[PDB]
C-alpha cells in the first residue's frame, strides 16, 4: 500500500523522474532498474510482477516506462490509475523532449506532481499481465 515511483526512458533505461521516502529501497530499487534494462520494444505495454510481499506495476507509452512498487495487498486496480495520471501529465509536459535528453533524472522537478498525485491514492478516505518478477529478471 506504500510508495516507490520511477519513470524511465525504455530504450536505455535512462531514469527520468522518481520519488522515494522511508521514514529497503536499496533492493527493490535495483530490481526496478533491472526491469528498465530488460524492457524493450517487444516487452508488454502493461504488466504486473509479483515479488513476494511486494508487487510491481507498470505501463509504457511513447518509449517511457511508468513503474510503481507497493505491498501486493494494494489494489492492482488503483496502481495503474495512478500510473495513468502520471503519464498524461508527463507526456503532455515533457513527452516531446524525452528522446533528446541524456542526463540522469533530467526531470527531477516532476518530483512535485508525482507526490501530490501519490497522496490521492494512498488514503482510502479520498478514494495486463502477471509474472513473478524473479522471472523476467
Amino acid at each position: 500500500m506504500v510508495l516507490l515511483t520511477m519513470i524511465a526512458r525504455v530504450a536505455d533505461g535512462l531514469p527520468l523522474a522518481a520519488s522515494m521516502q522511508e521514514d529497503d529501497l536499496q533492493q527493490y530499487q535495483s530490481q526496478a532498474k533491472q526491469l528498465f534494462r530488460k524492457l524493450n520494444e517487444q516487452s508488454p505495454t502493461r504488466c504486473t510482477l509479483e515479488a513476494g510481499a511486494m508487487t510491481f506495476h507498470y505501463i509504457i507509452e511513447q518509449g517511457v516506462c511508468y513503474l510503481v512498487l507497493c505491498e501486493a495487498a494494494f489494489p492492482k486496480k488503483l496502481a495503474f490509475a495512478y500510473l495513468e495520471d502520471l503519464h498524461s501529465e508527463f507526456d503532455e509536459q515533457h513527452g516531446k523532449k524525452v528522446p533528446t535528453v541524456s542526463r540522469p533524472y533530467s526531470f527531477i522537478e516532476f518530483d512535485t506532481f508525482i507526490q501530490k498525485t501519490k497522496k490521492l491514492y494512498i488514503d482510502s478516505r479520498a478514494r495486463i499481465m502477471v509474472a513473478n518478477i524473479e522471472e523476467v529478471l
Binding site: 500500500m1 495487498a73 494494494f74 489494489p75 488503483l78 497522496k119 494512498i122 488514503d123 482510502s124 478516505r125
Partner: protein, 699 residues
Amino acid sequence: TYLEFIQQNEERDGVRFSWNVWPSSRLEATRMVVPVAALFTPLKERPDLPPIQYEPVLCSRTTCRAVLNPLCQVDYRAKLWACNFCYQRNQFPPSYAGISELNQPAELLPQFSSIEYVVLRGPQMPLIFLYVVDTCMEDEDLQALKESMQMSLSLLPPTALVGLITFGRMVQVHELGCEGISKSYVFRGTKDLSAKQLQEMLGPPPSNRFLQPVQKIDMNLTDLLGELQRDPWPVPQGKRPLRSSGVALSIAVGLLECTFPNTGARIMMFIGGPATQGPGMVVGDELKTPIRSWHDIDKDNAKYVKKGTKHFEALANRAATTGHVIDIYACALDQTGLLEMKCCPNLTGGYMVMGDSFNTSLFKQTFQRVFTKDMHGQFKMGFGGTLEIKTSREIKISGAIGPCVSLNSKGPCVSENEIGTGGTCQWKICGLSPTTTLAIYFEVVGGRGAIQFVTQYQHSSGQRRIRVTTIARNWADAQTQIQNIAASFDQEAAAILMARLAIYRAETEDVLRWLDRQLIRLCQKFGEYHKDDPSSFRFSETFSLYPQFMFHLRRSSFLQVFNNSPDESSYYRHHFMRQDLTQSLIMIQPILYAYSFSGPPEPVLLDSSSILADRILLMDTFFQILIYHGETIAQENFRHLLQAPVDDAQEILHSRFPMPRYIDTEHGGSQARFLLSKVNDVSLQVFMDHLKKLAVSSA
C-alpha cells in the same frame, strides 16, 4: 386514596417506595419479598419553592447531626427542638431568636418537607467544560460536529472555563488564544500518562493556559473549532484509522485532575469510531475483522474487551474520585466501544448519547438539550453532589443503584448485606439533573419510620446548595401486620426496583431465575387462591399488574442481550438506571395508542390483537417513537387522522432528553418489526398460566 398518596408524595418529595408501610417486627422484615426500596430523585422540579438563604440548622450531636425538619418536635417557649432521629434536644441558633408560633421557620411546615438551602461563604468556582474531540470521521460528520460544539459555546456562562483537546493518531491539548500562532501540545496516543507526569510536561478568578474564561476566549475558540480538520494521518486500504480514544480521555482526566480537582467540570467527549490503539483499544485497524458482538464475547473471541474495559473503568473512578463528569457522544455506522467505556458516564453523572451520524437532527437536537436552561437562564445541571441518608435507628441501608460512587463512609446506618454500591451512608454524584434517579435499598433491623435525604451539590450559578427531603412512613400495626403492608404496595415502583437489581446483577454477572422465584413468592404471599387450583388465583388491584410488568421486563432487551449490539445494550441499561419511575415503565412496557375514525386517540394493549388494519398506532419506546399504518390506511378527515399521531409525537419527541429515534412505517414495511417485537416463556397468557400453576402449588 393510596394512589393520591403515592402521587402527591412523588410530586412533593420526588420519591417512591416499594412499600409505604413497613415491618414493625423482625419476623416480617426478614420475610419481606420485595425489598423496602425507594426510587429517589434528589433534584426534581416543582411549584417554585422558596430558596432558604439561611444556614439549614443542624442537630447538636456529633453522630446524628440531622437537619431540622417537620418531624422534629419543637417548643417555641423554650426556644428548643428535639431531633426526631436521636431525640437529642437542641437550642435554637441566634438568628432564630425571634422565632414564633404564628411565624415559624419554613423547614418545619409539612409542606416544606423536601426544601433547599443556599450556602454563600466561599467565592464560587467557575464552571469548567473540556471538549475532547475525535478527528477521525467523515467531513460532513466532522463539520456537523464542529457546528454543534460552536453552538454549545454560545450558551455557556461568561465565567465558565473552557479547554479543547482534539485527537486522532496523536492527542492534542490546545493552549487557547495564544495570539498570532495558535498552539497545542502533541502526545502519542500510544502510551498512557498519569497526571503528575502530564502536569510536569505541560507546566481574582483562576484559569490555566488550557482552561480560559469563556468571555475572554470565546472568539478564539469559536474560530479554532471552526478550522478543525480531520486527522492528518492517511488511512491505507483495508485499514481503520488510528484513533487514540483511550489516552485522549486519560489526558483529559489528568488535565483537570491536576488543574481543578474537586469542583464541577464537564469532560464532553465526541467519538466517531472505536478506539483502535489502546490503552482502551476496542478493535484492530484491520477492517477484515469486525468489532466484537455478544456472540463473539460469549465464545471468547474478543481479545480487547476486558483490558479495554478495565482501562476506562480505572479512568471512570479517577474522574469520579476527583469529582468530575464524563460525557460521551458517540456517532458512527459501526460500533464505538460503549461497552468498554460505559462506566465513565455511568459512575459519574455523565451523559451517553448514541446515533449514526453527528450530521443528523437526532444528534444535533439531543446535543443542544444538554444545555437547556430554566426560568433564570441557567443550566439544568448540578455538579459534585454528595448524597447522605439519615435513618431512624430501626432502618439500615443495603446500597444504591444508579449513577453514583461510594464515599465509603461507615456508620450504624450501614447494613451488613450490601446491594449495588453499598456499605455506605454517603454517595458521590459528580453530575446530576432534575431527572437523576438513584434506587436506595433499605433494610429493617405509635408508628412512623424516618429517612432523611441530604444532597449537597454545586449549582450552575456556582452557588453551593443543600437539598433536603425528610419522608416518614407508618410502622405496621402488630394486629394488622401484612394486611397493611399489602395495602401500601407500589407495584410500579417495585417492578422498577426489582428490575434495577436484576440488570445490575446481569451487567455484573441465571437472573431470570431469581426474578421468577420472587414473582412466584410474591404471588403466594399476597395473592388469593385454593392450593393446587390455578383458576382460583387472583391479585388485588394493588398487585394485579406486577405480573405483566415482570413478563415484559424478562423479555425486554435489558436482559435478553443477543439480537442487539453490546453497545446498544450498554446504552439502554445506562439510561434505565438513571430515569424516574414513569419513564422506566415506558421503557420496560412501551405505551401504545390507537388512531381510527371510530373514536379519538385511545391507549391499547401491547398485544398483536391491537394491530388493526384500519388503524394508526403510536408506540412510545422511551428510546424510539414509532407510528404504524395498518395495511388499509397504508394508502380533511383522512388528514386529521394521518397526522393525529404525528402531532402527538412531536410533543413528547422533545421533552425527552435523548431524543428518541422517530419512525414512520406500515404493514409490510421492514421497520414494522420494531412494533411486532414489543407486542404480544412464550406469550403473556401462557406466562400467566404457568405462574398460576406454580402459585397454587408448593411454596
